[PDB]
Write a protein that binds this DNA or RNA. Structure first.
Lengths: 144, 128, 250, 348, 185
RNA sequence: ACCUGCCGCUACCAUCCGUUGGAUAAUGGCUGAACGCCUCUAAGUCAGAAUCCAUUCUAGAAAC
RNA sequence: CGCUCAUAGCGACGCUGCUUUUUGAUCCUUCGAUGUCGGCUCUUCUUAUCAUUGUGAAGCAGAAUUCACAAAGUGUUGGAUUGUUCACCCACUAACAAGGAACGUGAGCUGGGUUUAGACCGUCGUGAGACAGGUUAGUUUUACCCUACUGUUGUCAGUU
RNA sequence: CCUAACUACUAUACAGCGAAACCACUGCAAGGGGAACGGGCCUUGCAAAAACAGCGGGGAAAGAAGACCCUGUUGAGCUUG
RNA sequence: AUUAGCAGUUUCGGGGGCGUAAUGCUCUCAGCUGAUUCUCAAACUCUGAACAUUUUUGGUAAGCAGAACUGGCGAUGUGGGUUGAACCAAAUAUUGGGAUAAGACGUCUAACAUUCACUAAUAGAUACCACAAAAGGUGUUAGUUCAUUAAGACAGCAG
């Protein structure tokens, strides 16, 4: 499965995007971003309820999608869709890497152990800072 | 029910199936009631219920893991009245899980074995 | 002769393998234990992810990786991550250290599922357990193949015992009798579980309903209408053979 | 890794120093806890293990399978000649434990009791043990100090023990050193316990008064010394197989590389026997009569339904013992020590 | 914050006399004497003449402020126990087995046999101010009565705790001896 | 060499023997505040484990 | 999901940790030498408790079972195959829990395996030879020292 | 299973004779840090002569400048276009 | 690299409604264009500064591998951090007196008094450094904000 996100939690690397040079990186788990009515005129929804991050880290795309579904589902159960319009104010652009080594019992033979250690792309990640909004909701004042 | 008799039939001891049902011997593979004690063989005394297979008998019952009563053994045990006793051969008789001998027992049946099991008394000729 | 630490040992693993035999040689690669049925169904599992290693193997137990002397000769290429896709699609799933288990437990899962589907006995038909046909399918001496489909394999094991024994190969029908007050929570439990007809409910008398049920599902429904109610409820036979079960021979 | 197959421990550690007992005869290191409800009575005695025999009795355990049926039960015969009481000793309770307070003796000290004080009795010409003491009873400026010594005991201290000793010389072993020990009196009101002490000076106490009939007693003794024995036969250790090089009667592994010393709990070869041991709940079946030194043979082994005028002694006497000619008591089961060994019986 | 002063006041009825000597309150009533120490408090228990008793606490915060109402209400319990002492009523509930109950008055003990058909006899002594007796009038009920609430309710709780079904489902069986009423006179 | 076999040693291959008090934990509770009520808890308090400490058992110290 | 019921019991999508009983990673000690697998044996420790004791929960009617707590005091087996650890069965059972101790334990053993030299076969190599493939036969040295342990004498800083 | 008894010679005791290996100094432990497994250092636990018979936990015990592994611009036996 | 709509085209490519049928009117709906909008990069830039700590690449990580400035250990003790190669103080000829530094000041252990709170856990107690997290608490102390009340408040007991 996926490696534990305690490995890729803190942003210690230079940022590393999908480009001409990072070729075959898999896609992001968060597919759609902006959810709600979203054809709503801005006079309708006056209330800006945010979710800002208090520590700087690498919020993984797999985490943003789970939080997105968890935020969509509870309001869709509560007051139905089109009672809100949230975007998501963070995009997973920094891609993670894994120097994958075999789980074999005779693993000295096969894997170049820390030789050519530069990992292959797994997933993506969003580099949030302290006080950077990740989930901005626009909704009516009857849903504070 | 009854007392401790001297156990002289371990695991791997063949004994003559005194039973008119089809066996010629009984090979004791474990005794019902033995637990524990690292490297000790499960022994059977008299009166014991053993799990046994037949190594010699009618072929329609020959590779099954059947249940038997040890009705006599030649390891001498003292009854608690002081008298000892030991029989001529080890012997067995096939039953069900409950302890119902469905055949007829031949030879003398030890009366430490007609105690716990009623139907071993009601198919015995000689209870000694 | 007396080295203080003995030499290299076998490469025991937990990793599935796929075969492709091309130009006289036997090429395998290491894959995932379930994610190769995630590849030959049309579903994508991100070709980086479906492999436990990208370098192509001669023998996956010996851990022997091929060379480009016998790769440009075999495949017509030497780029390994294109070799691994041809071996994945045009190969057949070979089997690891757990082959004997994932074949014997497979052929003992197969007889413990496909044989036990819809089977009632002779003499005013009743269902029964699985171990009776686990006796009576070795007794008919069935040899189980997997490449014939499981529904067809269900229709194959009961053909032999329609030929041999007197067994029924259809549905049945029941006429459930339940009292009105203490049986409605028994009604709405089996009403989305099985099919009903002739829902005839009263106030003064008893709810009488008729069923559309397989032959084998009766023994559950004899007991679940007592262990929930807590009283007596009556099993009355309606009919013994209805079609659109396995009688259409799908 | 770990211990592969799990087995119980080879040996008890509640007996662990496993050395020779320092008490040649068996020390009562705990007496029954005193209740002032009861009357004054002794609570220990000293027998000598004559031999062993088996008796037949009809069981009276309702519910059992042997019930109102004969049972052969083995019994040891402990020969108990009467014990002379020869002093008393007071014990005051202190913060560090009981301590010996004043130790009032008697006047006619026997020449067998005075042999305990003397390791070389034959070399001594004038046996001067307890000679300036017995002259306190002659005058009354010394006899006055005995009573002021004794009123210190019956006011200041809490445990009253009579220094009592046996008569080994009355049964012929080869011994004239008369085994001496303190028996704590266990009755109410310390001025009655010192009363029961001084009203028994120079007088003997029989075993039939201390120990009742059909009761459980404890047997303090010293077991049969089997010398320097190896670890199997000492602890119980499974023998190593037929092929072993250095020897097969050993504990194989005596520890891991990591405590890095041999534990005190590893079975090691050493002394067997001559261990001090007590045995609780040994039921007396019969207290036998004394045989008279002037009169006919009292049939001690005569029971009901037998009617044979015979002793407890078998044919040829007890093996490796004499005859039981003083009072005995036969209790069920075995007790520590061989024949001819001093046992300290004790009330439970 | 620890408040400067937090007092309470206990009203002594005219037939009761308290004898307090340094956090050791001792009521004396018509029906019996009762006493309890409060030496686990920094409290000046102090009486105003004959009718009042004033628990006081200088500079207590909480865990200390919270204790003056406790030791006021315990003195009120001691007072009410010696004017009109408490009488608890305990009722037998059983499914099938009629619970038998024995009572002597040596230590005023209760003995509870045929509880759930158990053959063990549930002999239980009472706390040392307490007696009890069966209700001839109301069926299946034993009334406890005493001079102190901490003895009476604890004796009742020991009857109730020792009258449980073990190793079963306690939501169904419900056989026991439970406290029903908690009257005074 | 074989047969029988003392003494001795020996074997669940034979025999005997292998306790009761206090304090606790888990938890169930009592009186009872904080917080007019409630509350096993905060001050106090009760029962309670193959547990812990003693009892009994083993040794008896540059201790008496 | 559990008929309804998120939380009796579970629990996806995510997140946060621990453990050093797996294998990696690294190369810090050791190459004028730490005897390296397994088993047998034996002791002690751990609790991440299988049973036993006391309790509390359940979709706990009884029985059976399941979750948790205080609990490591006391137990935790006989066997067929395999060198096996592991594995997988048969049978007993209150239960057949998981583990460390230099992957405990070779001056404790055995030497089955691995692992020298003989040899055979398969594939590779022209060949000498290779195999991390299969088979077969193949020296297991020393304690009398110090400590530790088990016992045994002995000195007791007014004499016995 | 499950060990038990017996016997000679050992070992053990005495008289006589009388070596060797090994040896930095040497010898009680816990934890800590340290070269990441201490007999020594640090903080603790403690600690009281001189010796005997055993024993195999340790002294990363002893025998051997590691035969495995790598380096060396060190060799050698054998093979081959 | 990349999210979301609103407008224009809108007849269009497709669906249809509308005049009875169509490049004919309008709607998602594609697409082209414009003003917006969310996140943005080591190999982007209009602009653009001043072993150990810091900058810093590979690695999940390391007491791992590799760099850059400075200071050290190696070479170097001493005082402190219980202990210690690198940390803090501070550098070593042999000493006496004084005041100090880091660090401490119940006893070991040289050195203390006064004062205000917080902690009621067997907790906690010198950075490196010998660990601890998400999530919780009607534990307590301080605090922010909103609401209720003599138009009778919360709570209790009742209609």
């Amino acid at each position: 499965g996926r490696r534990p996100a305690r490995c890729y939690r803190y942003c210690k690397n230079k940022p590393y995007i999908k480009s001409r040079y990072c070729r075959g990186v898999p896609d992001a788990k968060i597919r759609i971003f902006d959810l709600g009515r979203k054809k709503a005129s801005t006079d309708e929804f006056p209330l800006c309820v945010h979710l800002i991050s208090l520590e700087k880290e690498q919020l993984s795309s797999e985490a943003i999608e789970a939080g997105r579904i968890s935020c969509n589902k509870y309001i869709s159960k509560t007051g139905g869709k089109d009672s809100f319009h949230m975007r998501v104010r963070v995009h997973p652009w920094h891609v993670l890497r894994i120097n994958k080594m075999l789980s074999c019992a005779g693993a000295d033979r096969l894997q170049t152990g820390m030789r050519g250690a530069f990992g292959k792309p797994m997933g993506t990640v969003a580099r949030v800072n302290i006080g950077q909004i990740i989930f901005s909701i626009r909704t009516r004042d009857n849903m504070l | 029910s009854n007392y401790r008799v001297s156990l002289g039939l371990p695991v791997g001891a063949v004994m003559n199936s005194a039973d008119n049902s089809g066996a010629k011997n009984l090979y004791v593979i474990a005794v019902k009631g033995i637990k524990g004690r690292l490297n000790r063989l499960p022994s059977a005394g008299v009166g014991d219920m053993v799990m046994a297979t037949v190594k010699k008998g009618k072929p329609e019952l020959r590779k099954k893991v059947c249940t038997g009563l040890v009705v006599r053994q030649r390891k001498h045990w003292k009854r608690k009245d002081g008298v000892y006793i030991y029989f001529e051969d080890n012997a067995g008789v096939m039953c069900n899980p409950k302890g119902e001998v469905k055949g007829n027992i031949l030879g003398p049946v030890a009366k430490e074995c007609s105690d716990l099991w009623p139907k071993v008394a009601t198919n015995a000729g000689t209870i000694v | 002769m007396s080295i203080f630490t003995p030499t290299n040992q076998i490469r025991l693993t937990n990793v599935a393998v796929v075969r492709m035999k091309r130009a006289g040689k036997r090429f395998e690669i290491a894959c995932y234990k379930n994610k190769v049925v995630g590849w030959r169904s049309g579903v994508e599992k991100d070709l980086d992810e479906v492999l436990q290693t990208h370098s192509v193997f001669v023998n996956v137990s010996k851990g022997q990786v091929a060379k480009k002397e016998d790769l440009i000769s075999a495949f017509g290429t030497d780029d390994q991550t294109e070799i691994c896709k041809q071996i994945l699609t045009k190969g057949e799933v070979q089997v690891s250290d757990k082959e004997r288990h994932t074949q014997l437990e497979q052929m003992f899962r197969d007889i413990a599922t496909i044989v036990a589907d819809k089977c009632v006995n002779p003499e005013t038909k009743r269902p029964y357990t699985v171990i009776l046909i686990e006796r009576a399918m070795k007794d008919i001496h069935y040899s189980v193949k997997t490449n014939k489909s499981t529904k067809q394999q269900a229709l194959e094991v009961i053909k032999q015992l329609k030929e041999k024994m007197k067994i029924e190969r259809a549905h049945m029908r029941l006429r459930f009798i339940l009292p009105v007050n203490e049986g409605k929570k028994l009604k709405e439990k089996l009403k989305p579980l099985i099919k009903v007809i002739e829902s005839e409910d009263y106030g003064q008398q008893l709810e009488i309903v008729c069923l559309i049920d397989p032959g084998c599902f009766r023994e559950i429904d004899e007991l679940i209408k007592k262990e929930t109610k807590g009283k007596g409820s009556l099993e009355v036979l309606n009919l013994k053979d209805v079609e659109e079960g396995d009688e259409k021979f799908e | 890794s770990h211990r592969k197959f799990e087995a119980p421990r080879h040996g008890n550690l509640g007996f662990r120093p496993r050395k020779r007992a320092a008490r040649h005869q068996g020390k009562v290191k705990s007496f029954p806890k005193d209740d002032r409800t009861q009357k004054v009575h002794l609570t220990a005695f000293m027998g000598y293990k004559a031999g062993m025999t088996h008796v037949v009795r009809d069981l009276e355990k309702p519910g059992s399978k042997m019930h109102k049926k004969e049972i052969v039960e083995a019994v040891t015969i402990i020969e108990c000649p009467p014990m002379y009481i020869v002093g008393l000793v007071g014990y005051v309770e202190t913060a560090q434990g009981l301590k010996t307070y004043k130790t009032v003796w008697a006047q006619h000290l026997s020449d067998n009791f005075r042999r305990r004080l003397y390791k070389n009795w034959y070399k001594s010409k004038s046996k001067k043990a307890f000679t300036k003491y017995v002259k306190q009873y002659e005058t009354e400026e010394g006899k006055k100090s005995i009573e002021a010594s004794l009123q210190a005991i019956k006011k200041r201290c809490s445990v009253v023990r009579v220094i009592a000793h046996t008569q080994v010389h009355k049964l012929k072993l080869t011994q004239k050193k008369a085994h001496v020990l303190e028996i704590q009196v266990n009755g109410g009101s310390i001025v009655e316990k010192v009363n029961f002490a001084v009203a028994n000076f120079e007088k003997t106490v029989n075993v039939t008064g201390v120990f009742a009939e059909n009761e459980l007693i404890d047997v303090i003794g010293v077991t049969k010394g089997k010398g320097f024995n190896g670890v199997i036969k000492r602890w119980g250790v499974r023998k190593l197989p037929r092929k072993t090089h250095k020897g097969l009667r050993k504990v194989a592994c005596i520890g891991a590389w990591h405590p890095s010393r041999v534990s005190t709990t590893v079975p090691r070869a050493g002394q067997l026997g001559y261990h001090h041991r007590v045995e609780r709940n040994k039921k007396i079946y019969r207290i036998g009569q004394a045989q008279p030194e002037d009169g006919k043979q009292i049939s001690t082994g005569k029971t009901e339904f037998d009617l044979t005028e015979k002793t407890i002694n078998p044919m040829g006497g007890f093996a490796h013992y004499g005859m039981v000619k003083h009072e005995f008591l036969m209790l069920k089961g075995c007790v520590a020590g061989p024949r001819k060994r001093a046992l300290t019986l004790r009330k439970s | 914050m620890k408040v400067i002063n937090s007092s309470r006041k206990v009203q002594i009825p005219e037939n009761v006399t308290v004898d307090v000597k340094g956090r050791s309150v001792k009521v004396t009533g018509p029906r019996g004497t009762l006493s309890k120490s409060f030496d686990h408090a920094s409290v000046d228990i102090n009486l105003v003449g004959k009718k009042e008793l004033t628990v006081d606490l200088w500079f207590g915060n909480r865990k200390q402020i919270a204790c003056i109402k406790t030791i006021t209400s315990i003195i009120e319990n001691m007072i009410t126990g010696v004017t009109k002492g408490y009488e608890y009523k305990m009722r037998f509930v059983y499914a099938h087995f009629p619970i038998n109950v024995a009572v002597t008055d040596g230590g005023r003990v209760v003995e509870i046999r045929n509880f759930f058909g158990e053959k063990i006899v549930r002999r239980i002594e009472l706390l040392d101010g307490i007696t009890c007796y069966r209700n001839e009038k109301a069926k299946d009920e034993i009334v406890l009565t005493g001079n102190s609430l901490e003895l009476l309710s604890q004796s009742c709780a020991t009857i109730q705790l020792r009258s449980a079904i073990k190793y079963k489902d306690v939501r169904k069986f419900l056989d026991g001896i439970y406290v029903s009423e908690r009257n005074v006179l």
